[PDB]
Design a protein around this ligand. Structure first.
Ligand SMILES: [Hg+2]
Ligand SMILES: [Hg+2]
Ligand SMILES: [Zn+2]
Ligand SMILES: [Zn+2]
Lengths: 148, 148
């Protein structure tokens, strides 16, 4: 898709596909930054990821939506979020804008549960600071929409 | 999960989903590096991200397999791959291998047409060198397997 055309921060129905039986799997482009104009930090995006899916599962992931997974994009310009169900751009965003407020509520590293050799893949690649700025940005800038 | 006991390269199974209608979703931890011992290049996982995902599906997904999203983790030591269906370790540990050799089928960056600023949200960030790097290292170590 034309990354020059799209804007950020903005939800976007990334792809839609059905299950063999009946259930629905929707996949969202949770694009934080403006394609090639800005970029997420390998540490920020990482400490963030932890918190994001812990919180998006709180505001979103209710009873008629199911979260499979939320993980950062290689291009570190936002996360991809596959889920069981099919919310719309409003519903996700509202869930995203909330979460960021949830992230802010974490003053230090010992609050991030995983963050250790025994449970986090790469213990020293965490920046709660960078991951808070992002929240601030997003929360500040507002989460619009990007339709295909 | 105790990362310390984990082995890489190796396919681990991190999640299976039961959707109301029946069909089961599967999420696979694809671990390239030993956590906190070895890790992936930021510019390289991206590069390896446009490759892998495609090639994979060209050796996987069928009359019972459908991949939703192959995406890099934050820690940067592995790769989660969600799909509708239920293929096991050997069936993922094998096409990742078919998927790895093809990385080395990649001649140069001038083989990635998606490397435009209208299709890549971070086309600058790129390293087919480290693709091949990571690649040849995987095809030498042979993918193993981990059991939660
Ligand atoms: Hg940004
Ligand atoms: Hg590695
Ligand atoms: Zn981690
Ligand atoms: Zn890209």
């Amino acid at each position: 898709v034309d990354h020059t055309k799209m804007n950020a921060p903005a939800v976007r129905i990334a792809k839609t596909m059905l299950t063999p039986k009946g259930d629905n799997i929707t996949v969202f482009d949770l694009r934080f930054c403006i394609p090639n104009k800005e970029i997420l930090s390998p540490k920020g995006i990482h400490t963030l990821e932890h918190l994001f899916a812990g919180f998006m599962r709180d505001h979103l992931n209710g009873d008629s939506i199911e979260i499979i997974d939320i993980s950062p994009m290689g291009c570190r310009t936002g996360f991809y979020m596959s889920l069981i169900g099919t919310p719309n751009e409003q519903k996700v965003s509202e869930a995203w804008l909330a979460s960021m407020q949830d992230v802010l509520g974490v003053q230090d590293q010992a609050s991030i549960p995983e963050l250790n050799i025994y449970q986090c893949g790469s213990y020293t690649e965490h920046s709660l600071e960078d991951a808070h700025e992002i929240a601030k940005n997003v929360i500040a800038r507002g989460i619009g929409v990007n339709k295909n």
